[PDB]
Design a protein around this ligand. Structure first.
Ligand SMILES: CC(C)OCCCN(Cc1ccco1)C(=O)Nc1cn(C)c(=O)c2ccccc12
Ligand SMILES: CC(C)OCCCN(Cc1ccco1)C(=O)Nc1cn(C)c(=O)c2ccccc12
Lengths: 304, 304
């Protein structure tokens, strides 16, 4: 029992972190096989970041201008290319610690772990979610660009995020491992505002199921609702609309607890309308939305 | 910017996890050098757990009765001994992945990361704190015994916790790596109640400093207080008393923000008395106490 915000074990990703330096700019890179992936803004000077033309700036860079250091040893760069907002640096040595991996582009509401790194060295690991406005609420200081987000399925690491930027409001933006930004963000120092950060409804419901499984049941009410009635309330409270696909995904949690999905929706509707009244659920005084239904099943069953 | 509950990178500890089986009981072990450390109740059957006499039960066990599996390969046990509530199994092979390490016994209020494991395989990593009642609020299912808690200082892992038990209230109890339980708990299936789980005041203050550093400043008030006046309020709200040692530890955070420690105490006093009024601090609707002042400095400075 007990329910914690849990990150994946980070070892498989730690073995991939390298430092990439171009000129006087240093950030993190991800070394998989004989390729090092890093944010393309490693080629920029501070002055270039106001309005960079990456294709033009890249012309002034050769293989020998990219310094890649894995631990305290230098990797030889034998090729380089730009794919969207990431640079792929071909090195002469395959990473001996390369885990089985995939590159995946996640949808909003999906969670993942971030291994925050500085100078190619891991500092910590935390769990977060792709917000519905395509930002993440991370913990990133200068030098953390190139840190990655991932999920693990047994022995395969699915990389889903690479850190690029902080918006002026302190929220974070980045790309998938193909270099495509999540959301409308661009790698340029121009003020970019985020859209509404709505609450991930299917994740709140999953966490209410986790709470029932662990014995926090005070919020269970005597009501039910429909998807349409619930969604009227969800819209009022800036919660994402609940679809039958979300209901389907909650099926195993509904089966384990015996609480119909629409009954849990009605309990969540009452929590939104009445508030918590100074009470807590799983040690939180607000409704947690960074656990997917799969995370709850995984944590409550002990998948390794 | 951004402030997250961050665990240490778990790779160095992942390389130490093994599965230990004795008879039909299986749990996790920690392999450092040529010794595997695990909870002594691996020698017990379910019936023995009601009132075990470990010294007597251990007489019926030889080296060949302990099965230690590291990955999918078996380690040869060449010696065994009981130290308090842990068994030390001497193996014929030093763990090639043994990191630099120390065994430390932490004080209440100190935080650490837990690598939850099942069958010697890591499932996840989370950050928690030794509560003032010497329990931890973890996330542990059957099979998680032997999972460890640790802190990392550059390349040295300081192991501070080994998981042994869940109390009937769903909170967790365990030992240091010398086998001494934190608190008064015993490894026997007898109902054991925990004392008052008070809030770690110095950690709440540290987290209020982290909030100011990241721009959440609404709670900053126009008051100051004294240690004695603050402690009258702390006692009323089941907060640990604040000492001058805690004030000393908050010094670097006071210096960085320009907010005197006693001024932050007065702001915390007003939050305790007025509540949050539906507002949040660092995305939390309650006062967080599982960040030490050192964790805040580390996270806000980017120590790797
Ligand atoms: C858009 C994201 C990716 O980067 C944002 C941060 C960009 N950097 C850091 C960086 C990345 C590569 C090379 O330098 C940066 O120096 N920008 C600034 C540019 N200029 C001209 C300023 O005057 C300035 C003033 C204050 C703070 C930042 C800046
Ligand atoms: C005290 C801590 C360490 O262990 C608590 C759990 C102890 N175990 C598991 C275990 C560890 C080693 C061997 O078995 C256990 O089986 N106890 C029970 C004993 N008996 C006799 C019951 O009837 C019973 C009924 C329901 C649930 C648990 C038990």
């Amino acid at each position: 029992s007990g329910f914690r915000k849990m990150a994946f074990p980070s070892g498989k990703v730690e073995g991939c972190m390298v430092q990439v330096t171009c000129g006087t700019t240093t950030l993190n890179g991800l070394w998989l096989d004989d390729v090092v992936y890093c944010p393309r803004h490693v080629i920029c000077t501070s002055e270039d970041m106001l309005n960079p033309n990456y294709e033009d700036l890249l012309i002034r860079k050769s293989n020998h201008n990219f310094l890649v250091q894995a631990g305290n040893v230098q990797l030889r760069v034998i090729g380089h290319s730009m794919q969207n907002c990431v640079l792929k640096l071909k090195v002469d040595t395959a990473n001996p610690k390369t885990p089985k991996y995939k590159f995946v582009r996640i949808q909003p509401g999906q969670t993942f772990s971030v291994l925050a790194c500085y100078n190619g060295s891991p500092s910590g690991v935390y769990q977060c979610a792709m917000r519905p406005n395509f930002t993440i609420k991370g913990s990133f200081l200068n030098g953390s660009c190139g840190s990655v987000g991932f999920n693990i399925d047994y022995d395969c690491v699915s990389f889903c995020y690479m850190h690029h930027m902080e918006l002026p409001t302190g929220v974070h933006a980045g790309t998938d491992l193909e270099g495509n930004f999540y959301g409308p963000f661009v790698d340029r120092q121009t003020a970019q505002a985020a859209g509404t950060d709505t609450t991930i409804t299917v994740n709140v419901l999953a966490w209410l199921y986790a709470a029932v499984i662990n014995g926090d049941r005070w919020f269970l009410n005597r009501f039910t609702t429909t998807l349409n009635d619930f969604n009227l309330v969800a819209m009022k409270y800036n919660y994402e609309p609940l679809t039958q696909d979300h209901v389907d995904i909650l099926g195993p949690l509904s089966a384990q607890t015996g609480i119909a999905v629409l009954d849990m929706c009605a309990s969540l509707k009452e929590l939104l309308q009445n508030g918590m009244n100074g009470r807590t659920i799983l040690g939180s005084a607000l409704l947690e939305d960074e656990f997917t239904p799969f995370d709850v099943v995984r944590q409550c069953s002990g998948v390794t």
